[PDB]
Amino acid sequence: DMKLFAGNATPELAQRIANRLYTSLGDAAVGRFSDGEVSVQINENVRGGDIFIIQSTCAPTNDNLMELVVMVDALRRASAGRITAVIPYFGYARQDRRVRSARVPITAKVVADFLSSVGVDRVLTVDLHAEQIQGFFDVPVDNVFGSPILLEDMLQLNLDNPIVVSPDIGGVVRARAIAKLLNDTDMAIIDKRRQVMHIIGDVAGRDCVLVDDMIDTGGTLCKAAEALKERGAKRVFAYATHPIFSGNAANNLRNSVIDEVVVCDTIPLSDEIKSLPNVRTLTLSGMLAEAIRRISNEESISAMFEH
Amino acid sequence: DMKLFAGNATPELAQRIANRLYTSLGDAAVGRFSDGEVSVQINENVRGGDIFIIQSTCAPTNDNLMELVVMVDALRRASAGRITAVIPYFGYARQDRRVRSARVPITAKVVADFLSSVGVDRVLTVDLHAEQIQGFFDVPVDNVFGSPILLEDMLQLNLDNPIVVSPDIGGVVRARAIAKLLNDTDMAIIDKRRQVMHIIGDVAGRDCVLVDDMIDTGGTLCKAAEALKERGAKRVFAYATHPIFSGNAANNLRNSVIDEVVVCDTIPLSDEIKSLPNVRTLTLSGMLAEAIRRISNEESISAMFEH
Amino acid sequence: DMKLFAGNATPELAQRIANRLYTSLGDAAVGRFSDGEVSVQINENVRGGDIFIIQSTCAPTNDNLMELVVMVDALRRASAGRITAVIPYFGYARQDRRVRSARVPITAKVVADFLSSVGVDRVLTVDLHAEQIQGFFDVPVDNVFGSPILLEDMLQLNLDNPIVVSPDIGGVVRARAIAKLLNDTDMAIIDKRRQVMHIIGDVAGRDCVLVDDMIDTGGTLCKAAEALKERGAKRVFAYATHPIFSGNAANNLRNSVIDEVVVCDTIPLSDEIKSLPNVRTLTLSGMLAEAIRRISNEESISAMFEH
Amino acid sequence: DMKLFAGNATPELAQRIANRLYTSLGDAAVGRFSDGEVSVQINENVRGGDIFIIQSTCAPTNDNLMELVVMVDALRRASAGRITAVIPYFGYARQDRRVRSARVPITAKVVADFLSSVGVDRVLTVDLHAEQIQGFFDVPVDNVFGSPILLEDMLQLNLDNPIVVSPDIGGVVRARAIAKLLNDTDMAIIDKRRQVMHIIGDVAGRDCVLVDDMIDTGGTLCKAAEALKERGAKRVFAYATHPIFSGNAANNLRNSVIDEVVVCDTIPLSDEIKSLPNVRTLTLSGMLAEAIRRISNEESISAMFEH
Amino acid sequence: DMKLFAGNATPELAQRIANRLYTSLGDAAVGRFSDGEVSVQINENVRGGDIFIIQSTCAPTNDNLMELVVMVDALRRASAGRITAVIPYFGYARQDRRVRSARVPITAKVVADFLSSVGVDRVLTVDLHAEQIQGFFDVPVDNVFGSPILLEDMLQLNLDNPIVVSPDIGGVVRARAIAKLLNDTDMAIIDKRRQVMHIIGDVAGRDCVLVDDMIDTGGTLCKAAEALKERGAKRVFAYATHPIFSGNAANNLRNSVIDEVVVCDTIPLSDEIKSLPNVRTLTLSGMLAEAIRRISNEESISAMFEH
Amino acid sequence: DMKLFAGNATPELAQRIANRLYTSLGDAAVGRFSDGEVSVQINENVRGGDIFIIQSTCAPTNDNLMELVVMVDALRRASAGRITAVIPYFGYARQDRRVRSARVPITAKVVADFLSSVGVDRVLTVDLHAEQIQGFFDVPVDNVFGSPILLEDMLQLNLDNPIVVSPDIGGVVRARAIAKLLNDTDMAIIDKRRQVMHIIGDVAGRDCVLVDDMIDTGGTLCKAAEALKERGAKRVFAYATHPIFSGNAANNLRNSVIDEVVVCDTIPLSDEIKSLPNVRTLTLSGMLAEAIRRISNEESISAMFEH
Ligand SMILES: Nc1ncnc2c1ncn2[C@@H]1O[C@H](COP(=O)(O)OP(=O)(O)O)[C@@H](O)[C@H]1O
Ligand SMILES: Nc1ncnc2c1ncn2[C@@H]1O[C@H](COP(=O)(O)OP(=O)(O)O)[C@@H](O)[C@H]1O
Ligand SMILES: Nc1ncnc2c1ncn2[C@@H]1O[C@H](COP(=O)(O)OP(=O)(O)O)[C@@H](O)[C@H]1O
Ligand SMILES: Nc1ncnc2c1ncn2[C@@H]1O[C@H](COP(=O)(O)OP(=O)(O)O)[C@@H](O)[C@H]1O
Ligand SMILES: O=P(O)(O)OC[C@H]1O[C@H](O)[C@H](O)[C@@H]1O
Ligand SMILES: O=P(O)(O)OC[C@H]1O[C@H](O)[C@H](O)[C@@H]1O
Ligand SMILES: O=P(O)(O)OC[C@H]1O[C@H](O)[C@H](O)[C@@H]1O
Ligand SMILES: O=P(O)(O)OC[C@H]1O[C@H](O)[C@H](O)[C@@H]1O
Ligand SMILES: O=P(O)(O)OC[C@H]1O[C@H](O)[C@H](O)[C@@H]1O
Ligand SMILES: O=P(O)(O)OC[C@H]1O[C@H](O)[C@H](O)[C@@H]1O
Ligand SMILES: [Mg+2]
Ligand SMILES: [Mg+2]
Ligand SMILES: [Mg+2]
Ligand SMILES: [Mg+2]
Ligand SMILES: [Mg+2]
Ligand SMILES: [Mg+2]
Ligand SMILES: [Mg+2]
Ligand SMILES: [Mg+2]
Ligand SMILES: [Mg+2]
Ligand SMILES: [Mg+2]
Ligand SMILES: [Mg+2]
Ligand SMILES: [Mg+2]
């Protein structure tokens, strides 16, 4: 008995996933009270069932997170069998340590503790900001890479001796993995000091593919593209998995030298961003549906990591 | 070493409490990141200290709650000694059971579990919606009544043989307590059936004092006042502790037959409500400051329940 | 594999429930050692089974509670699958908060913690004193109302314009629910001050039905009946779910003006009470058997709340 | 701030301990409600204090145990600093394993879990039935031997080449320890087969000292004394720490060949037993008072194990 | 789906058990990294399976224990259904209490806590040093006696009026059980004082069977055999379950008066010990295989305790 | 009351730290039993004290880890006040996630859970392999960088326009931090594909400083030095914090082109490595002593992160 439930964060992605599983979303009233508190009621029998909840903890982050945890509590008190939280974008993942013992929280651990406390039995995410967040849980956590879809899109561009560039130092590992997958090309690294951007590697007369896990504001992405074009690069493409696009992202991307921005659909796009002519979206519904299928049928999940 | 910290929910109440304790609020940067996630940094040494956090979980409820739990986590990882959460208004307290085994959450228990998980050592609240929420925690919970302040204000009205009325059946116990405190007057009960309001008790030619724990939308309060005046009551006064005032509350209170609405300051008022000429606010800063003083000095807290 | 086990608190109710499920009680030796400590031995295979334990925590309360928790521990170490505690009367439910921060325990929370610690997976009760005790547990708790049986008995009395009266202020909500179920009649409230009883509502020349969750000593019930008859009421009937009947209850009920006392069978009656001519018992075995049937077969439990 | 509290199990022992500490027992109302549920109220400030609760879990075992756990919960919610449970006799200690995987509970572990759940910080006991019960807790457990007092009494008897006998096989280790302390005498062992008692060791023409941790019914003790006298022993003395004396113990001890029965005061004696002419009581109040003194002042507890 | 996995501690015993279950060991790479840290990889699907891990925590104890806990963590994160730890010899079982409140650990409790923390669901052991270690866990623990195999071997020796001797005082209970099983013979006890060995019981002209749970160094066993032969015993046989054989055990057994040493196979023997001509090994693979079979099929485990 | 205790892993480092704190190491017997199990006895009063345990979990890793956890359990049962584990090198830190959902453990989380279970209150480490391991704990974890000491040593070399090189992609962040501290020089990255080493950045005619967190076998370090010298680098220096030096490290470093290897003293060096002429050791005893001093006196720990 596989049952799918959705929040208000990613309803269209949940509908696409349900379509690919040839089922329909479970019936649950999830809204707000008059004063703004989350209201949840499960409107069908879930006793002993195998429940999947699809919801990203994207902006508005706190409302979406409260929605998810309140759904889990409601399902657990209604005697559900197993609850899997499908969280395509995991919010608060960038607050994952205390640098220099700064008096800051580790909020990703706080969220993992909340999810474990309400009774989640498994978590399925896409491209966690830090892979070590798998260890913040006691339950199995499956971190699925979005790189197959993005690489499939890259290979249909016919790039001229492309080079893979990471816009910052934190993305070097991911950029190297993408480069090894992309016909084993070269990689370059953007190094930022003091306000100048230093490029390590040769980009003269080559197509540049900027790869990142997310695009939050686009300031550093636009600056990296500007530096790459100033050092003589033909075309610049930006590939990311999570389209956060917060703050002044639309204006930054509009007045930029990037030829194409390609993102996945873990977060719904705004009308502001969708109006842009050079922003393209790929879908992860098939990959997530296959992962849900394998989890539900007790099959091996390692098959999801092939290109 | 008593240190006070405040969130963004009730900063002026926290400042008043700090003034009455002859100290100043601790220095902590509490704001938002670009995408809307809560940002917290404690900017002073708190090692081994006795920390009090003042913040209501009022609207926007989820942001305020996340702010509180993230502050507690940051303080606990910074080696604070004891953390007391002063929550003048406790949000989600109305979701306290599952009626008829409805597939709903018990969200007050979820919030209590979150607070216990991040490391709170004591909770101090004002007029919990259900007193049994004290049992949702393992830590001491002090539920302080706001009835001394409201009764002091009532006794300066010179009411003509007043009668204490509860606007619904859930408030009968509180209304009876207020009536016994108010020179041992009579009490009447509003009974609602089907859309008509039935009044049990005699209100003909008497001043009526409606007492409630909160005013959320004011619809039932205005209806009760209308019924009381239709059964021949001279003047109607509304007394409450928590001024939620959500939805259409301002228009409901403007076009109403209530002579005076008196509330406490557990939730800041909007400009919409503050423009109203017949809404008056009492302060709880002295009572909360005395409670904090007694907790900090290891004195008996039972002295707080005298009129 | 549904297996029923019984303690020494309510053996005849357990036998009736087993009869209605067309099974027999499981074989377990549950007694005392020489010095009075509880002795338990499960005398059949329970590995992987779906176990229901039927036992009220009624007087002697502590022995019955220890019996229940020791049974649960014995079954859990014998590799039982799922353990449901059917507790028709939940003892210690009246100690559910600390009024005015009195240095008292919250013993209902203590008992819930004990039950959760030994390994109970679900609780099924009848008419909890406070519904918020559902939140004292992490496991599902089904609070089943006894009002269908009592209302069925009420409707066979042919009352003359009956009015529903709550003997105290704590029972107003339940009395209102019963009144709305009883052809939508009126309700009156007994208000006690200082030693006099004040009645809010008109009872002149009407049949009065006193409704309560329990009858502990009968002092307040007899006083309320006396006041109702003094204000000119034709007949007084007392309806309750839990027949505790402690202290001087038999003498109070014998020298009283109540025409009929009707109770359920969550607690066995003594010979003292059974000798009384105007005390009648209704059975809850059918309702509890249906609830157990629905829990065992993973059906919806919401069907149990219809009249 | 050392505060002593007592239950209703061992009030005179608690008073003696308080006398030896030159303090007085703390003021707390500990009784029963009308229906038999435990009632507790702490009538003094205990905030931040160092609390000791003196109560044996002796017969009636379940009432005493519930009294203790309810006291601990009340003190913990009243913000006590540290709670030490002084349990001179630990009930349910004989149910400490499952022999041959019998479907029985391990009730000593259940009681340890209850005590840990309510918030006990340290346990102090006398002559635990199994020393491994120390490992049933997470908190420090100090198991103090009563053998110094009993050995002091033995050495004032002027025994004629005494031999130390264990009435069963479970007491051989304790009997050997006593024998090594008693001028390094010999030891004999009572072996019971099938209904006959086999004695291993020579007892012809010697004084026999039977040593045990407890005397529950006295049947095996009287049988062992009978066998020892039949194999030609001059005088038989019985020494034990815990005087349970359940069932037919008084008649067994009256019609027995034992010259003297000496016990400690961990359990109050009945009038039935106190009427016996050959039963003598030693006091442990000094030893327990010294242990409490050392725990309170953060001194080494190893000094308590010298003769 | 029963799956067997083995560590590096007892691979041949695991292979024998797998042979008797007519299955094969599961495929898992369990070794060491370059620096000596344990490396584990499960090389087959275990989702929802019923997993048994066979590994003794014998010398090198800490490596074997870490191997076991790391395997359990790997299997739990791979979504295994139920994990049973089959630990034929349980290391650290001799550190089971704090005698005289010595500042020592209770390491058996530490190991039980580690096993419970990684997610073990059941433990199956052979001849625990202290049976109360069953209470150190929350999960079912089945302590299976090795006495059937040893008694079967004893009865094929044709002993001349044998007497069962325990080499120390801690083994008296086990020696008595063996004696009652061995045609209800007599038992004698070795008592050690100061450096001399005192024998309680008559051994003149009888065959002596020394029975113990383990043989660690053999010093006390050889001394007991020497004393027994000095008091005129014909032949001395040593029977034990766990062949630890540490330190100078081989030289002690070589220069000893023991005619035969018979042990089980819970710990692999060294070449040093296997070279000895009078050391014989019995197998427990059949008994453990039957226990695993009964656990897997949800049958009663009490059938394992018959001779 | 600050008390220092040491294991057998890093006794000389512990002695140096004790010397810099002008105290002496606490008296505790920490060794092995005959069969190889860890033996611990605390030989002084620690009641209420502030205890620091200094021990790296270096090779033999499992013995050292068991030593640490057993010490913590012994101290916690002896009523210690606060226990801080000073672990200069944290073993198992490289097993921090499951790549591609490989059926592997997260052993760093297992070790963190063990430490939290025995009762550690704070952890102090040096240069954790992954900083996110701070989130594997609930307690404060202070990750102190060793870069001040190494940078002080670097600045006394008089390098000719040095360039900072990371031997692999996982060390790029640390290499960049070191480069920014080292007069804001340039950085180069070693990229390994397929067996060839690709260098991103210009190293022609410059001094190269290889920086890493650890040196396990030295194979990749020697290969990186060889590649750097083949692309025309004057001198190559290797700087690391943790000198693991496992496997064939001594032969790799002997037959290498590295001019100097400088490491800290978190792990004792072998005689094999100490015989090498171009391996130099720096001490961290002063920095760790200052950190312990600040923790003990409740001072801010942020002062430890300045150069
Ligand atoms: N403001 C208030 N003051 C006093 N009691 C209150 C108040 N609000 C709610 N209550 C509840 O009303 C109940 C009345 O109990 P109490 O005041 O002791 O009188 P009695 O027990 O005689 O009815 C208490 O249990 C308390 O929890
Ligand atoms: N026997 C009963 N039947 C129905 N409700 C009851 C009963 N006893 C107590 N109650 C409580 O009375 C409250 C009345 O709510 P409800 O019956 O939904 O009507 P309304 O919400 O319109 O007042 C419920 O929250 C329920 O918890
Ligand atoms: N009253 C007692 N005094 C001393 N030991 C006792 C007593 N009762 C039981 N014992 C147990 O007897 C065992 C004997 O150990 P010990 O007295 O150290 O001598 P040895 O170790 O030489 O046999 C101890 O482990 C202790 O737990
Ligand atoms: N020795 C070190 N000194 C400083 N930072 C280090 C060191 N080793 C690793 N790091 C990491 O490098 C990251 C660089 O951040 P930071 O030094 O604040 O500069 P920026 O944030 O401008 O890149 C930090 O998050 C820190 O965790
Ligand atoms: O917020 P921006 O820097 O503009 O863009 C998002 C980046 O911030 C984080 O490093 C993310 O990993 C991205 O690299
Ligand atoms: O939301 P409204 O009914 O308009 O006003 C608030 C009321 O709703 C809850 O019962 C509260 O206790 C109040 O009585
Ligand atoms: O103990 P009595 O007051 O005599 O009768 C039982 C009552 O006490 C509690 O309020 C129960 O709810 C009943 O109303
Ligand atoms: O119950 P009885 O056997 O008569 O006397 C008490 C004995 O029962 C237990 O073994 C105790 O340890 C005693 O040896
Ligand atoms: O270590 P040894 O004394 O030489 O032989 C093992 C004995 O040590 C323990 O008591 C075991 O139970 C054995 O009796
Ligand atoms: O084991 P080696 O690769 O030879 O040297 C140690 C390296 O292995 C890990 O990445 C460490 O971080 C080091 O970079
Ligand atoms: Mg990052
Ligand atoms: Mg980035
Ligand atoms: Mg309500
Ligand atoms: Mg209301
Ligand atoms: Mg009540
Ligand atoms: Mg009542
Ligand atoms: Mg025993
Ligand atoms: Mg005995
Ligand atoms: Mg032993
Ligand atoms: Mg032994
Ligand atoms: Mg790494
Ligand atoms: Mg590396």
Would you write up a description of this structure?
- Chain A has 307 residues and is of the alpha/beta class.
- Chain A folds into 2 domains: 1-145 and 283-307, no CATH class; 146-282, no CATH class.
- In chain A, 30% of the residues lie in helices and 24% in strands.
- Chain A has 9 helices and 14 strands.
- Chain A has helices spanning 11-20, 61-77, 107-118, 147-154, 172-181, 219-230, 249-254, 271-274, 285-296, and strands at 2-6, 28-32, 38-42, 50-54, 82-87, 122-126, 141-144, 163-166, 186-193, 196-200, 208-214, 236-242, 260-263, 279-281.
- In chain A, the strands form 3 sheets. In chain A, strands 10-9-8-11-12-13-14 form a 7-stranded mixed β-sheet, with helices on both faces. In chain A, strands 1-4-5-6-7 form a 5-stranded parallel β-sheet, with helices on both faces.
- In chain A, α2 runs parallel beside α3 (107-118).
- The longest helix of chain A is centred in the first third of the chain and has 17 residues, at 61-77.
- Chain A is globular, with a radius of gyration of 20 Å.
- Chains in contact: A-B, A-C, A-E, A-F, B-C, B-D, B-F, C-D, C-E, D-E, D-F, E-F.
- Bound molecules: adenosine-5'-diphosphate (4 copies), 5-O-phosphono-alpha-D-ribofuranose (6 copies) and magnesium ion (MG) (12 copies).
- One 5-O-phosphono-alpha-D-ribofuranose binds next to β11 and α6 of chain A.
- Chains A, B, C, D, E, F: Keywords: Allosteric enzyme, ATP-binding, Cytoplasm, Kinase, Magnesium, Manganese, Metal-binding, Nucleotide biosynthesis, Nucleotide-binding, Transferase.
- Chains A, B, C, D, E, F: The active site is at 192.
- Chains A, B, C, D, E, F: GO terms for molecular function: ADP binding; ATP binding; identical protein binding; kinase activity; magnesium ion binding; phosphate ion binding; ribose phosphate diphosphokinase activity.
- Chains A, B, C, D, E, F: It is found in: Cytoplasm.
- Chains A, B, C, D, E, F: Mg(2+) 1 binds at residue 129.
